[PDB]
mmCIF file of C-alpha atoms and ligand atoms in Angstrom:
data_model
loop_
_atom_site.group_PDB
_atom_site.id
_atom_site.type_symbol
_atom_site.label_atom_id
_atom_site.label_comp_id
_atom_site.label_asym_id
_atom_site.label_seq_id
_atom_site.Cartn_x
_atom_site.Cartn_y
_atom_site.Cartn_z
ATOM 1 C CA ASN A 118 63.555 -39.090 21.237
ATOM 2 C CA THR A 119 62.118 -39.960 17.816
ATOM 3 C CA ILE A 120 59.607 -38.683 15.261
ATOM 4 C CA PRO A 121 56.608 -41.005 14.882
ATOM 5 C CA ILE A 122 55.307 -41.783 11.394
ATOM 6 C CA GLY A 123 52.257 -44.000 11.064
ATOM 7 C CA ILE A 124 52.159 -46.958 8.695
ATOM 8 C CA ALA A 125 48.606 -48.174 8.121
ATOM 9 C CA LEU A 126 48.721 -51.109 5.712
ATOM 10 C CA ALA A 127 47.059 -54.497 5.312
ATOM 11 C CA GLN A 128 49.201 -56.853 7.380
ATOM 12 C CA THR A 129 46.417 -59.422 7.727
ATOM 13 C CA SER A 130 43.582 -60.674 5.472
ATOM 14 C CA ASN A 131 43.956 -61.554 1.798
ATOM 15 C CA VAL A 132 44.662 -57.855 1.238
ATOM 16 C CA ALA A 133 48.022 -58.564 2.930
ATOM 17 C CA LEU A 134 49.027 -60.391 -0.254
ATOM 18 C CA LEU A 135 49.633 -56.813 -1.429
ATOM 19 C CA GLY A 136 50.198 -55.121 1.925
ATOM 20 C CA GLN A 137 53.080 -57.256 3.147
ATOM 21 C CA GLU A 138 55.226 -56.154 0.192
ATOM 22 C CA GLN A 139 54.543 -52.567 1.215
ATOM 23 C CA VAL A 140 55.500 -53.331 4.815
ATOM 24 C CA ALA A 141 58.785 -54.784 3.559
ATOM 25 C CA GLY A 142 59.563 -51.596 1.629
ATOM 26 C CA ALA A 143 58.667 -49.391 4.579
ATOM 27 C CA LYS A 144 60.972 -51.342 6.907
ATOM 28 C CA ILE A 145 63.865 -51.077 4.440
ATOM 29 C CA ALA A 146 63.223 -47.321 4.267
ATOM 30 C CA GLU A 147 63.264 -46.987 8.058
ATOM 31 C CA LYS A 148 66.717 -48.550 8.259
ATOM 32 C CA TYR A 149 68.038 -46.673 5.217
ATOM 33 C CA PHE A 150 66.986 -43.273 6.514
ATOM 34 C CA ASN A 151 67.830 -43.859 10.173
ATOM 35 C CA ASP A 152 71.297 -45.080 9.176
ATOM 36 C CA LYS A 153 71.683 -41.663 7.547
ATOM 37 C CA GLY A 154 70.765 -39.919 10.789
ATOM 38 C CA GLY A 155 66.988 -39.732 10.393
ATOM 39 C CA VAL A 156 65.749 -36.154 10.465
ATOM 40 C CA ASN A 157 68.854 -34.023 11.046
ATOM 41 C CA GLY A 158 70.029 -36.442 13.721
ATOM 42 C CA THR A 159 66.632 -37.383 15.166
ATOM 43 C CA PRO A 160 65.574 -40.936 14.282
ATOM 44 C CA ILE A 161 62.172 -41.627 12.816
ATOM 45 C CA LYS A 162 60.051 -44.359 14.312
ATOM 46 C CA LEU A 163 57.593 -46.153 12.082
ATOM 47 C CA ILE A 164 54.501 -47.161 14.011
ATOM 48 C CA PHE A 165 52.653 -49.994 12.300
ATOM 49 C CA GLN A 166 48.897 -50.354 12.765
ATOM 50 C CA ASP A 167 47.298 -53.154 10.758
ATOM 51 C CA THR A 168 44.228 -52.076 8.771
ATOM 52 C CA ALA A 169 43.151 -55.636 7.964
ATOM 53 C CA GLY A 170 41.117 -55.923 4.775
ATOM 54 C CA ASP A 171 38.114 -53.619 5.129
ATOM 55 C CA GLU A 172 37.081 -49.988 5.660
ATOM 56 C CA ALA A 173 36.291 -50.237 9.366
ATOM 57 C CA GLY A 174 39.730 -51.693 10.085
ATOM 58 C CA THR A 175 41.365 -48.846 8.169
ATOM 59 C CA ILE A 176 39.377 -46.174 9.983
ATOM 60 C CA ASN A 177 40.321 -47.795 13.295
ATOM 61 C CA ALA A 178 43.999 -47.922 12.332
ATOM 62 C CA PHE A 179 44.026 -44.266 11.263
ATOM 63 C CA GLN A 180 42.259 -43.131 14.446
ATOM 64 C CA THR A 181 44.678 -45.089 16.624
ATOM 65 C CA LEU A 182 47.691 -43.624 14.801
ATOM 66 C CA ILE A 183 46.304 -40.088 15.016
ATOM 67 C CA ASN A 184 45.077 -40.144 18.591
ATOM 68 C CA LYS A 185 47.034 -42.678 20.634
ATOM 69 C CA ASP A 186 50.278 -42.759 18.656
ATOM 70 C CA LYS A 187 50.394 -39.015 17.909
ATOM 71 C CA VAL A 188 51.898 -39.560 14.456
ATOM 72 C CA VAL A 189 53.043 -36.609 12.345
ATOM 73 C CA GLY A 190 51.666 -38.283 9.224
ATOM 74 C CA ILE A 191 50.369 -41.562 7.804
ATOM 75 C CA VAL A 192 51.586 -43.806 4.995
ATOM 76 C CA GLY A 193 48.667 -45.879 3.720
ATOM 77 C CA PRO A 194 46.292 -47.466 3.329
ATOM 78 C CA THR A 195 46.858 -50.398 0.952
ATOM 79 C CA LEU A 196 43.661 -50.297 -1.147
ATOM 80 C CA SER A 197 41.848 -47.469 -2.890
ATOM 81 C CA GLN A 198 38.676 -49.085 -1.513
ATOM 82 C CA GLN A 199 39.973 -48.392 1.988
ATOM 83 C CA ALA A 200 41.300 -44.923 1.146
ATOM 84 C CA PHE A 201 37.924 -43.533 0.049
ATOM 85 C CA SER A 202 36.420 -44.370 3.452
ATOM 86 C CA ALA A 203 39.346 -43.674 5.770
ATOM 87 C CA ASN A 204 41.237 -40.791 4.161
ATOM 88 C CA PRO A 205 38.423 -38.317 4.930
ATOM 89 C CA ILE A 206 39.073 -39.099 8.631
ATOM 90 C CA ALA A 207 42.658 -37.908 8.284
ATOM 91 C CA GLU A 208 41.574 -34.962 6.126
ATOM 92 C CA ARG A 209 39.140 -33.781 8.812
ATOM 93 C CA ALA A 210 41.814 -34.246 11.497
ATOM 94 C CA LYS A 211 44.391 -32.322 9.415
ATOM 95 C CA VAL A 212 46.860 -35.207 9.364
ATOM 96 C CA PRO A 213 48.769 -35.807 6.131
ATOM 97 C CA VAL A 214 48.323 -39.098 4.284
ATOM 98 C CA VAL A 215 50.673 -40.313 1.578
ATOM 99 C CA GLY A 216 49.298 -43.314 -0.302
ATOM 100 C CA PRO A 217 51.984 -45.678 -1.552
ATOM 101 C CA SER A 218 50.049 -47.648 -4.144
ATOM 102 C CA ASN A 219 46.421 -46.545 -4.367
ATOM 103 C CA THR A 220 45.668 -45.800 -7.981
ATOM 104 C CA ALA A 221 41.907 -45.268 -8.360
ATOM 105 C CA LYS A 222 40.781 -42.022 -9.952
ATOM 106 C CA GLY A 223 39.977 -39.355 -7.372
ATOM 107 C CA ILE A 224 42.138 -40.161 -4.353
ATOM 108 C CA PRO A 225 44.175 -36.913 -4.042
ATOM 109 C CA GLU A 226 40.926 -35.033 -4.646
ATOM 110 C CA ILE A 227 39.664 -36.344 -1.281
ATOM 111 C CA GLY A 228 41.299 -33.304 0.290
ATOM 112 C CA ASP A 229 44.233 -31.010 0.982
ATOM 113 C CA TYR A 230 45.957 -33.566 3.235
ATOM 114 C CA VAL A 231 45.860 -36.502 0.812
ATOM 115 C CA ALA A 232 48.744 -37.161 -1.582
ATOM 116 C CA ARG A 233 50.045 -40.284 -3.323
ATOM 117 C CA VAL A 234 53.318 -41.455 -4.871
ATOM 118 C CA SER A 235 51.565 -43.853 -7.234
ATOM 119 C CA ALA A 236 50.446 -42.652 -10.675
ATOM 120 C CA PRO A 237 46.780 -43.495 -11.334
ATOM 121 C CA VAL A 238 45.229 -46.224 -13.468
ATOM 122 C CA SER A 239 44.765 -43.804 -16.384
ATOM 123 C CA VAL A 240 48.515 -43.643 -17.069
ATOM 124 C CA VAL A 241 49.554 -47.113 -15.880
ATOM 125 C CA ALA A 242 47.014 -49.524 -17.396
ATOM 126 C CA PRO A 243 47.053 -48.625 -21.125
ATOM 127 C CA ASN A 244 50.690 -49.691 -21.542
ATOM 128 C CA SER A 245 49.870 -53.330 -20.878
ATOM 129 C CA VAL A 246 47.258 -53.345 -23.658
ATOM 130 C CA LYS A 247 49.826 -51.818 -26.011
ATOM 131 C CA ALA A 248 52.328 -54.500 -24.937
ATOM 132 C CA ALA A 249 49.828 -57.292 -25.653
ATOM 133 C CA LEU A 250 49.261 -55.879 -29.139
ATOM 134 C CA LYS A 251 52.993 -55.736 -29.777
ATOM 135 C CA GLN A 252 53.346 -59.423 -28.885
ATOM 136 C CA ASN A 253 50.293 -60.323 -30.953
ATOM 137 C CA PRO A 254 49.259 -57.712 -33.536
ATOM 138 C CA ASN A 255 46.357 -59.949 -34.584
ATOM 139 C CA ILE A 256 44.391 -59.565 -31.360
ATOM 140 C CA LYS A 257 40.843 -58.503 -32.282
ATOM 141 C CA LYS A 258 38.459 -59.706 -29.557
ATOM 142 C CA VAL A 259 38.852 -58.792 -25.898
ATOM 143 C CA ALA A 260 37.056 -60.107 -22.818
ATOM 144 C CA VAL A 261 37.241 -57.995 -19.660
ATOM 145 C CA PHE A 262 36.706 -59.115 -16.033
ATOM 146 C CA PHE A 263 36.474 -56.882 -12.965
ATOM 147 C CA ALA A 264 35.835 -57.061 -9.234
ATOM 148 C CA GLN A 265 32.662 -55.042 -8.837
ATOM 149 C CA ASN A 266 33.004 -54.668 -5.047
ATOM 150 C CA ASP A 267 36.420 -52.953 -5.255
ATOM 151 C CA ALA A 268 36.880 -49.237 -5.985
ATOM 152 C CA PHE A 269 40.261 -49.547 -7.690
ATOM 153 C CA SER A 270 39.098 -52.486 -9.828
ATOM 154 C CA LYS A 271 36.124 -50.474 -11.077
ATOM 155 C CA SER A 272 38.348 -47.495 -11.854
ATOM 156 C CA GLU A 273 40.962 -49.643 -13.593
ATOM 157 C CA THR A 274 38.465 -51.548 -15.725
ATOM 158 C CA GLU A 275 37.049 -48.297 -17.108
ATOM 159 C CA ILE A 276 40.527 -47.390 -18.338
ATOM 160 C CA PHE A 277 41.116 -50.857 -19.807
ATOM 161 C CA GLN A 278 37.767 -50.769 -21.605
ATOM 162 C CA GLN A 279 38.422 -47.304 -23.034
ATOM 163 C CA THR A 280 41.888 -48.389 -24.188
ATOM 164 C CA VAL A 281 40.452 -51.486 -25.904
ATOM 165 C CA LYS A 282 38.041 -49.214 -27.776
ATOM 166 C CA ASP A 283 40.713 -46.654 -28.667
ATOM 167 C CA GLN A 284 42.961 -49.396 -30.030
ATOM 168 C CA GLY A 285 40.154 -50.399 -32.405
ATOM 169 C CA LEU A 286 39.474 -53.750 -30.736
ATOM 170 C CA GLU A 287 36.135 -55.509 -30.150
ATOM 171 C CA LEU A 288 34.968 -55.704 -26.538
ATOM 172 C CA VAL A 289 33.122 -59.037 -26.544
ATOM 173 C CA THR A 290 32.088 -59.085 -22.875
ATOM 174 C CA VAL A 291 32.537 -57.468 -19.482
ATOM 175 C CA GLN A 292 32.195 -60.037 -16.682
ATOM 176 C CA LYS A 293 31.810 -59.159 -12.990
ATOM 177 C CA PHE A 294 33.045 -60.976 -9.898
ATOM 178 C CA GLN A 295 33.709 -60.265 -6.208
ATOM 179 C CA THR A 296 37.188 -60.123 -4.676
ATOM 180 C CA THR A 297 36.036 -62.756 -2.178
ATOM 181 C CA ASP A 298 35.014 -65.249 -4.878
ATOM 182 C CA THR A 299 37.181 -68.304 -5.491
ATOM 183 C CA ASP A 300 35.083 -69.861 -8.282
ATOM 184 C CA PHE A 301 34.715 -68.205 -11.674
ATOM 185 C CA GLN A 302 33.554 -71.096 -13.830
ATOM 186 C CA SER A 303 30.445 -69.357 -15.146
ATOM 187 C CA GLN A 304 32.109 -66.028 -16.062
ATOM 188 C CA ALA A 305 35.178 -67.751 -17.490
ATOM 189 C CA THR A 306 33.079 -70.062 -19.650
ATOM 190 C CA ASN A 307 30.878 -67.131 -20.777
ATOM 191 C CA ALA A 308 33.987 -65.335 -22.000
ATOM 192 C CA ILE A 309 35.692 -68.390 -23.498
ATOM 193 C CA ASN A 310 32.612 -69.104 -25.621
ATOM 194 C CA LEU A 311 33.092 -65.706 -27.295
ATOM 195 C CA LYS A 312 36.569 -66.677 -28.548
ATOM 196 C CA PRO A 313 38.573 -63.752 -27.176
ATOM 197 C CA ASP A 314 42.183 -63.223 -28.257
ATOM 198 C CA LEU A 315 42.915 -61.210 -25.116
ATOM 199 C CA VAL A 316 41.543 -61.332 -21.563
ATOM 200 C CA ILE A 317 41.964 -58.461 -19.099
ATOM 201 C CA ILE A 318 41.471 -58.899 -15.344
ATOM 202 C CA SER A 319 40.993 -56.140 -12.762
ATOM 203 C CA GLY A 320 40.853 -57.656 -9.296
ATOM 204 C CA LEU A 321 43.150 -58.313 -6.365
ATOM 205 C CA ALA A 322 45.709 -61.089 -5.905
ATOM 206 C CA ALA A 323 43.984 -64.221 -4.603
ATOM 207 C CA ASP A 324 40.912 -63.642 -6.765
ATOM 208 C CA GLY A 325 42.909 -62.597 -9.832
ATOM 209 C CA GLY A 326 45.217 -65.602 -9.532
ATOM 210 C CA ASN A 327 42.334 -68.035 -9.136
ATOM 211 C CA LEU A 328 40.630 -66.560 -12.222
ATOM 212 C CA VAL A 329 43.813 -66.821 -14.315
ATOM 213 C CA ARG A 330 44.200 -70.480 -13.318
ATOM 214 C CA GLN A 331 40.584 -71.321 -14.098
ATOM 215 C CA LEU A 332 40.653 -69.613 -17.493
ATOM 216 C CA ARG A 333 43.617 -71.789 -18.429
ATOM 217 C CA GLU A 334 41.982 -74.930 -16.965
ATOM 218 C CA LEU A 335 38.896 -74.242 -19.074
ATOM 219 C CA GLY A 336 41.007 -74.155 -22.237
ATOM 220 C CA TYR A 337 41.677 -70.460 -22.838
ATOM 221 C CA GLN A 338 44.926 -70.140 -24.819
ATOM 222 C CA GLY A 339 44.974 -66.422 -25.604
ATOM 223 C CA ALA A 340 46.822 -63.510 -24.022
ATOM 224 C CA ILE A 341 46.106 -62.324 -20.478
ATOM 225 C CA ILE A 342 46.647 -58.923 -18.873
ATOM 226 C CA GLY A 343 46.446 -58.566 -15.109
ATOM 227 C CA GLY A 344 45.807 -55.215 -13.475
ATOM 228 C CA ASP A 345 47.723 -53.764 -10.552
ATOM 229 C CA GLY A 346 45.912 -55.911 -7.982
ATOM 230 C CA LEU A 347 47.614 -59.003 -9.465
ATOM 231 C CA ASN A 348 51.032 -57.335 -9.367
ATOM 232 C CA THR A 349 52.727 -59.606 -6.831
ATOM 233 C CA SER A 350 54.613 -62.904 -6.850
ATOM 234 C CA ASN A 351 51.953 -64.010 -4.352
ATOM 235 C CA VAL A 352 49.855 -64.893 -7.402
ATOM 236 C CA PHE A 353 52.459 -67.539 -8.387
ATOM 237 C CA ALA A 354 51.237 -69.964 -5.706
ATOM 238 C CA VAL A 355 47.658 -69.656 -6.925
ATOM 239 C CA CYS A 356 47.964 -70.107 -10.686
ATOM 240 C CA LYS A 357 51.343 -71.960 -10.603
ATOM 241 C CA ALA A 358 52.545 -72.874 -14.108
ATOM 242 C CA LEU A 359 49.307 -71.422 -15.490
ATOM 243 C CA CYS A 360 50.401 -67.890 -14.456
ATOM 244 C CA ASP A 361 52.882 -68.003 -17.335
ATOM 245 C CA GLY A 362 52.630 -65.155 -19.828
ATOM 246 C CA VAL A 363 50.408 -62.786 -17.845
ATOM 247 C CA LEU A 364 51.264 -59.149 -18.646
ATOM 248 C CA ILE A 365 51.210 -56.595 -15.831
ATOM 249 C CA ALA A 366 52.072 -52.907 -16.102
ATOM 250 C CA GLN A 367 54.713 -51.555 -13.722
ATOM 251 C CA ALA A 368 55.366 -48.162 -12.135
ATOM 252 C CA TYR A 369 58.818 -49.205 -10.941
ATOM 253 C CA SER A 370 61.839 -50.943 -12.445
ATOM 254 C CA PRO A 371 64.567 -52.666 -10.407
ATOM 255 C CA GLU A 372 66.981 -51.736 -13.203
ATOM 256 C CA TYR A 373 66.356 -47.988 -12.920
ATOM 257 C CA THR A 374 69.781 -46.447 -12.299
ATOM 258 C CA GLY A 375 69.025 -43.822 -9.652
ATOM 259 C CA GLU A 376 71.561 -44.010 -6.818
ATOM 260 C CA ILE A 377 68.872 -44.510 -4.182
ATOM 261 C CA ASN A 378 67.284 -47.298 -6.224
ATOM 262 C CA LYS A 379 70.651 -49.019 -6.462
ATOM 263 C CA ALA A 380 70.893 -48.785 -2.674
ATOM 264 C CA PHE A 381 67.269 -49.862 -2.212
ATOM 265 C CA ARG A 382 67.525 -52.689 -4.747
ATOM 266 C CA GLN A 383 70.801 -53.948 -3.296
ATOM 267 C CA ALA A 384 69.354 -53.880 0.216
ATOM 268 C CA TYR A 385 66.230 -55.691 -0.993
ATOM 269 C CA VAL A 386 68.003 -58.371 -3.076
ATOM 270 C CA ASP A 387 70.541 -59.162 -0.362
ATOM 271 C CA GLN A 388 67.680 -59.879 2.048
ATOM 272 C CA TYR A 389 64.870 -61.347 -0.061
ATOM 273 C CA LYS A 390 66.917 -63.051 -2.819
ATOM 274 C CA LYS A 391 64.876 -61.504 -5.643
ATOM 275 C CA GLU A 392 64.221 -58.134 -7.272
ATOM 276 C CA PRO A 393 62.191 -55.587 -5.277
ATOM 277 C CA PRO A 394 58.469 -55.626 -6.173
ATOM 278 C CA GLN A 395 56.694 -52.425 -7.212
ATOM 279 C CA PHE A 396 54.684 -52.316 -3.975
ATOM 280 C CA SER A 397 57.881 -52.391 -1.902
ATOM 281 C CA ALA A 398 59.475 -49.577 -3.908
ATOM 282 C CA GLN A 399 56.324 -47.471 -3.621
ATOM 283 C CA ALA A 400 56.197 -47.869 0.153
ATOM 284 C CA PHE A 401 59.878 -46.924 0.404
ATOM 285 C CA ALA A 402 59.180 -43.802 -1.658
ATOM 286 C CA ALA A 403 56.287 -42.762 0.593
ATOM 287 C CA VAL A 404 58.493 -43.000 3.695
ATOM 288 C CA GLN A 405 61.234 -41.109 1.827
ATOM 289 C CA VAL A 406 58.783 -38.288 1.114
ATOM 290 C CA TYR A 407 58.121 -37.934 4.842
ATOM 291 C CA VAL A 408 61.783 -38.127 5.861
ATOM 292 C CA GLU A 409 63.005 -35.587 3.339
ATOM 293 C CA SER A 410 60.078 -33.251 4.017
ATOM 294 C CA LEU A 411 60.682 -33.466 7.764
ATOM 295 C CA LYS A 412 64.358 -32.594 7.179
ATOM 296 C CA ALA A 413 63.478 -29.606 5.014
ATOM 297 C CA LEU A 414 60.862 -28.416 7.509
ATOM 298 C CA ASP A 415 63.139 -28.946 10.516
ATOM 299 C CA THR A 416 65.860 -26.843 8.883
ATOM 300 C CA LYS A 417 63.410 -23.930 8.408
ATOM 301 C CA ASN A 418 61.380 -24.430 11.578
ATOM 302 C CA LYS A 419 62.768 -26.776 14.246
ATOM 303 C CA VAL A 420 60.220 -29.569 14.555
ATOM 304 C CA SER A 421 60.919 -30.485 18.184
ATOM 305 C CA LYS A 422 59.472 -27.083 19.151
ATOM 306 C CA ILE A 423 56.348 -27.208 16.960
ATOM 307 C CA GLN A 424 53.168 -28.449 18.623
ATOM 308 C CA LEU A 425 51.590 -31.469 16.938
ATOM 309 C CA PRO A 426 48.619 -29.913 15.100
ATOM 310 C CA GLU A 427 50.805 -27.202 13.562
ATOM 311 C CA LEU A 428 53.552 -29.746 12.842
ATOM 312 C CA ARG A 429 51.106 -31.897 10.863
ATOM 313 C CA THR A 430 49.876 -28.906 8.891
ATOM 314 C CA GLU A 431 53.389 -27.626 8.142
ATOM 315 C CA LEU A 432 54.577 -31.107 7.180
ATOM 316 C CA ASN A 433 51.675 -31.470 4.755
ATOM 317 C CA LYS A 434 52.460 -28.069 3.229
ATOM 318 C CA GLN A 435 56.152 -28.942 2.930
ATOM 319 C CA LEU A 436 55.806 -32.407 1.381
ATOM 320 C CA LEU A 437 53.649 -31.048 -1.429
ATOM 321 C CA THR A 438 56.457 -28.692 -2.509
ATOM 322 C CA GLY A 439 59.273 -31.231 -2.507
ATOM 323 C CA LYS A 440 61.240 -32.933 -5.270
ATOM 324 C CA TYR A 441 62.376 -36.480 -4.497
ATOM 325 C CA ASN A 442 64.858 -38.811 -6.150
ATOM 326 C CA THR A 443 63.234 -42.111 -5.212
ATOM 327 C CA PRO A 444 63.349 -45.747 -6.326
ATOM 328 C CA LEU A 445 60.394 -44.812 -8.573
ATOM 329 C CA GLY A 446 62.552 -42.151 -10.205
ATOM 330 C CA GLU A 447 62.442 -38.396 -9.791
ATOM 331 C CA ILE A 448 58.998 -37.491 -8.485
ATOM 332 C CA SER A 449 57.127 -34.474 -7.163
ATOM 333 C CA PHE A 450 53.513 -33.488 -6.534
ATOM 334 C CA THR A 451 50.913 -31.349 -8.254
ATOM 335 C CA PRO A 452 49.229 -28.786 -5.998
ATOM 336 C CA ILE A 453 46.401 -31.310 -5.423
ATOM 337 C CA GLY A 454 48.730 -34.095 -4.265
ATOM 338 C CA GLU A 455 48.848 -36.138 -7.458
ATOM 339 C CA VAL A 456 52.251 -37.598 -8.256
ATOM 340 C CA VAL A 457 54.401 -36.294 -11.095
ATOM 341 C CA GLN A 458 56.263 -39.313 -12.558
ATOM 342 C CA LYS A 459 57.817 -39.971 -15.970
ATOM 343 C CA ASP A 460 58.612 -43.638 -16.573
ATOM 344 C CA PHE A 461 56.385 -46.703 -16.803
ATOM 345 C CA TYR A 462 57.001 -50.292 -17.861
ATOM 346 C CA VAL A 463 55.348 -53.633 -18.531
ATOM 347 C CA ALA A 464 56.493 -56.980 -17.178
ATOM 348 C CA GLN A 465 55.461 -60.519 -18.015
ATOM 349 C CA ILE A 466 55.214 -63.457 -15.642
ATOM 350 C CA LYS A 467 57.603 -66.249 -16.603
ATOM 351 C CA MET A 468 57.052 -69.475 -14.703
ATOM 352 C CA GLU A 469 59.340 -72.435 -14.584
ATOM 353 C CA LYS A 470 57.655 -75.491 -16.143
ATOM 354 C CA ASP A 471 57.125 -77.215 -12.793
ATOM 355 C CA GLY A 472 55.155 -74.181 -11.629
ATOM 356 C CA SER A 473 56.873 -73.825 -8.255
ATOM 357 C CA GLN A 474 58.990 -70.800 -9.162
ATOM 358 C CA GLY A 475 58.717 -67.777 -11.411
ATOM 359 C CA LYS A 476 59.707 -64.188 -12.018
ATOM 360 C CA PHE A 477 58.574 -60.951 -13.605
ATOM 361 C CA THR A 478 60.478 -60.310 -16.832
ATOM 362 C CA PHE A 479 60.544 -56.661 -17.847
ATOM 363 C CA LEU A 480 59.790 -55.952 -21.489
ATOM 364 C CA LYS A 481 62.364 -53.721 -23.175
HETATM 365 MG MG1 MG B 679 45.162 -33.610 -2.132
#
C-alpha cells in the first residue's frame, strides 16, 4: 500500500528540455523520502503522466492523474503557459497543485488549490540585470527579445523592461519571436543595428539557444542575459562555444549548506556527474512539500482512513501552513500559495573553447 502523488511534467516535446531536469529531481526525491520511510512508514508512489508541450496535453495529464490514478495531489506542470489552462481543472476538482518552476505573475491566484515553490519573475529577473551592470558599468543601450506566444516569457519580459528603465538604461528595441521559431535573422539584425551594449532574451531553451547563437554569428559582442527558460545545460548543445558569457538568474545554489541540499546535491552529483540544476532542485522541493505535509496530516488525522476528496482538501490546507527546509533553502507559503523564499543568485555560462562542454559559474 502506497500514497499516489501525480507528477505532470513535460517528458516529451522541446518543453522536455526543461521538464526532464524536473523529472530527475522528482525521482531523486522519491528515493530520498521513501528511504526515510515515506509517510510515517507508508511509501509514496510518484505517478508520472507526460503533459507533452501544449495545454491540451497538460489538461489530459491532469485529468488522468485525478480520475484514473486517484492522486492525492499534483506536482506540475512545467510551463506557466500550461498552468494557466490546466490548473483551473485541478482547482475545480479540489485537487492540490504545487508548481515546481512556473514563475509567471498570477499563478497562485488561479485558486485556493494552486501553490508554487518557485519565486516569480518579479524577484528573480532583476538580479541578472544588476549583475550585467556590475560586470560592465558602461552599459547604456539594451535590446530585449521575447517569445510572444508564451505566458511566462511575456511576464518575464515586462519585469526585464521595467528593470532596464529603473536602472536608467535606454531600451532601444523590443523584438518578438515564437518559441517554435528556429530563425531569428531579422530580429537579431534589427537589434544589432541599434548598437546595444546588453541583450536580454525571454524564451524557452531551444529557441533561446538558437537566438543566442545567431546573435553571436551576426557579430554581436555585447553582454547577454537569458531568462529562466534558458536556464538549462540543454542550451549548450545549441549555442556551443557561443553560449559563453550568458548571465542567468538562479533560485537555487548547489553550494547552499542546508543538510537536505547536501544530501540532494551529493545524490545528484554522484549520479549525473555535475551540479544539480535549478529545475531539479525545484522539483525535489515540490515533492518534499507533499511528503512532509502528508506526514503532518497523517499524524493529526490518519490518512489511510480519509476518503479521497476530503484527503485532497485536508492535504491542500496542510501544505499551505508548513515550513520546509528544502534544497532551495527554508521556504513556506503565503495564504494565497505564493512561496516565501530569501536567497537568489546569478550564474554565468562558461564554455570550454571547443564548445562541447560547459558549466554554470555562480557569481559571488
Ligand atoms: Mg493559491
